[PDB]
């Protein structure tokens, strides 16, 4: 029989990195109410608010997030159940 357990697991690297620039991530989300890659279910981003940042999940699974602020951010995304988050941190 059909059941809902849309099982999300990311990796994030929680580190620091110079200012403009992106970064690579890895997200597999899939329900056994429907085998699918991470980006149905619209995983929410969230940046942290310094100067700029804008953080996208790729529709395959890997996401791209995009920092370019001064100082210290912190971006966290969930979607369904599990969730994560990754640090961000550009300094001089």
Not at 35 to 63: E, F, K, M, P, R
């Amino acid at each position: 029989m059909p059941a809902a357990l849309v099982s999300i697991s990311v990796s994030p690297t929680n580190s620091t990195v110079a200012k403009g620039l992106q970064e690579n991530f890895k997200a597999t989300g899939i329900f056994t109410d429907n085998s699918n890659s991470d980006i149905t279910d619209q995983v929410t981003w969230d940046s942290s608010n310094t100067d700029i940042l804008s953080i996208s999940n790729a529709s395959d699974s890997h996401g791209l997030a995009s920092t370019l602020n001064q100082g210290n951010v912190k971006v966290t995304a969930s979607i369904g159940g599990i969730q994560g988050s990754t640090d961000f941190k550009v300094t001089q």
